[PDB]
């Protein structure tokens, strides 16, 4: 059963699924000093899912942490309040 490929796996990190106190103030304290805020940066620096990233993004934009540039679906583009 020769296959003529190699087929190595990957590391498959465990990004957080429900949000708790240690994640909550961590997003509260470091969404400033982010020049550009989106779903994918929040996944990479905070280890939360796209679910949490999209809902938290909606959360901040009414109360005040991040300013919007563009509110198109599947791509949210956010800047800092200086």
């Amino acid at each position: 059963k020769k296959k003529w490929s190699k087929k190595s796996m990957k590391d498959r990190a465990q990004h957080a699924v429900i949000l708790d106190q240690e994640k909550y103030d961590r997003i509260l304290k470091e969404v400033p000093t982010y020049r550009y805020v989106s779903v994918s940066v929040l996944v990479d620096r905070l280890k939360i899912g796209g679910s949490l990233a999209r809902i938290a993004l909606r959360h901040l934009e009414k109360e005040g942490i991040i300013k919007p540039i563009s509110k198109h679906s599947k791509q949210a583009i956010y800047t800092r309040a200086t």
Binding site: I18, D20, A56
Partner: protein, 145 residues
Amino acid sequence: SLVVQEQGSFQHILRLLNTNVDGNIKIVYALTTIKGVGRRYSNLVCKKADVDLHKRAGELTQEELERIVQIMQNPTHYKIPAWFLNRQNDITDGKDYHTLANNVESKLRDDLERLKKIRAHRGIRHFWGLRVRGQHTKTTGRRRA
């Protein structure tokens, strides 16, 4: 808008119908790990149980998931329209079933055994392991075993 502090009751694993359902996903997609329930059915039970479908599997209350499993195991008594069940109008009992987890595997072997026992054509095709739905076999499924 709604951020919510999840608490210490949470479960990374849960057991319904003798299967290790993984947590950390939405409840309807999570219960599809249990055999005999697929995405359509899973939506209807959690709808008939009046649960918030937005929740993850690991955070749902103890009474709610036992309420869910009752609606799965007595479906048509709780107003499921019963053409929605998989094994309806059964060959001995006459009544509409809905096999779950082990029943699906065990009852599937049994009705195979009738066609093998009466020597029906489909049963003899299963005993050889060939196709039974009238497919061509001259090229396809070549390295099946």
